[PDB]
Amino acid sequence: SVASFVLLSMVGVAVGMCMCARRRCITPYELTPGATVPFLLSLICCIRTAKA
Amino acid sequence: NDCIFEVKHEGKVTGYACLVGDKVMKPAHVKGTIDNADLAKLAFKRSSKYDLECAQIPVHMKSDASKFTHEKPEGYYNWHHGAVQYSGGRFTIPTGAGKPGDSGRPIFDNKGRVVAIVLGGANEGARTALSVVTWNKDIVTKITPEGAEEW
Amino acid sequence: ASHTTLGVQDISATAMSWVQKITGGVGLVVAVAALILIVVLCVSFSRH
Ligand SMILES: CC(C)CCC[C@@H](C)[C@H]1CC[C@H]2[C@@H]3CC=C4C[C@@H](O)CC[C@]4(C)[C@H]3CC[C@]12C
């Protein structure tokens, strides 16, 4: 039980701080008008475009 | 001028087809029949990704096709309904100029060249945003402002 | 019979060796088609 809890907590920390990295890398593009996010970066960070 | 062919549905006009370069183009969302029989009959091709509906002009007897240009400098252009302001990556129109069922009318530059084709618009407030189909040097693209409903 | 009954995959021998070649080739064609379709779809979504 302790090992399962530790490993699940590590996985949760990994995904949460991956989300944190996503937010940090994405917010400046969502602040800049025009939002010409390259398609490769949209695929990598799994985002939607604001201009359709 | 007068390079526009009417697309008539059974009981009314639904859209407009235009001769650009070597091809006749129509909005693929417009249901109806081409006014000219030689073009209504002509085997006709469909692409829903850009909502565009193409065929090759019988250039032997259609030499009046309009000329085009992929350059989009900032400023004013002509829409058969007033002046369109191309600003940023968008076209803006006076809200009362366009109406549903008028899709397919091209946008002219100051030289009489087709720059883009209106596929629809968006009730934008003090203006209306114009959702169009334009082209780069080699490829077409569709500009769809948010909230644009079908015309 | 002193031997036991055998299943589908057991009797297959060099016929199995053959269907390996045939399935490998045809599935390779399928995989190439899948790669072409995937790259075409990826390029298509880059044009908006
Ligand atoms: C593709 C060509 C070249 C070869 C294909 C051979 C196949 C169709 C042949 C190989 C010999 C055969 C099998 C050998 C043994 C068994 C197990 C038995 O309980 C039922 C029949 C069954 C299942 C046979 C069915 C048909 C079979 C699988």
A51 at the B interface (CB within 8 A)? yes
Using CA of residue B27, residue B31, residue B35, residue B36, what is the dihedral sign? Answer: positive
C46 at the B interface (CB within 8 A)? no
C-alpha closest to that of B3 among B112, B121, B144: B112
Chain CA centroid to CA B17, Å: 8
C-alpha closest to that of B71 among B107, B118, B115: B115
| Amino acid type, C33 | A
- Residue showing tokens 């530790």: A6
Q: What technique was this entry resolved by?
A: cryo-EM
Phi, psi of B124 (to 5 degrees): -110, -10
**A5: helix, coil or strand?**
helix
DSSP state of B67: P
Burial class (CB in 10 A: 0-12, 13-18, 19+), A27: exposed
Chain CA centroid to CA B127, Å: 19
C46 at the A interface (CB within 8 A)? yes
Whether C47 and B141 lie within 8 Å, measured CB to CB = yes
Q: Which residues pair with B16 in a beta bridge?
A: B6
Q: Whose CA is nearest to atom 16 of ligand 1?
A: C8
Phi, psi of B117 (to 5 degrees): -120, 125
How many CB atoms neighbour CB B113 within 10 A?
17
Interatomic CA distance for residues B99 and A14, integer angstroms: 53
Interatomic CA distance for residues B77 and B16, integer angstroms: 19
Stretch 33-52 of chain A: residues touching chain C, C-beta under 8 Å: 39, 52
**DSSP letter string over C1-48?**
--SPP--TTGGGHHHHHHHHHHHHHHHHHHHHHHHHHHHHHHHHTT--
- Residue showing tokens 């829903």: B48
Pair of tokens at residue B28:
């693929």
Residues of B marked as catalytic: 29, 51, 103
CA distances from A34 to B71, B97, C45 (A): 19, 27, 18
C-beta of residue B13 within 8 angstroms of C-beta of residue B35: no
For B37, residues 6+ apart whose C-beta sits below 8 A from its C-beta are none
CA distances from B12 to B28, B60, B119 (A): 17, 30, 19
Chain CA centroid to CA B126, Å: 23
For B145, residues 6+ apart whose C-beta sits below 8 A from its C-beta are B90, B122, B124, B129, B130, B131
Angle at B16 between CA B15 and CA B21, to 5 degrees: 150
Chain CA centroid to CA B80, Å: 11
For B115, residues 6+ apart whose C-beta sits below 8 A from its C-beta are B68, B69, B70, B71, B72, B77, B106, B107, B108, B109, B134
Chain CA centroid to CA B83, Å: 15
List of chain A residues whose C-beta atoms are within 8 Å of the C-beta of residue B89: 34, 51
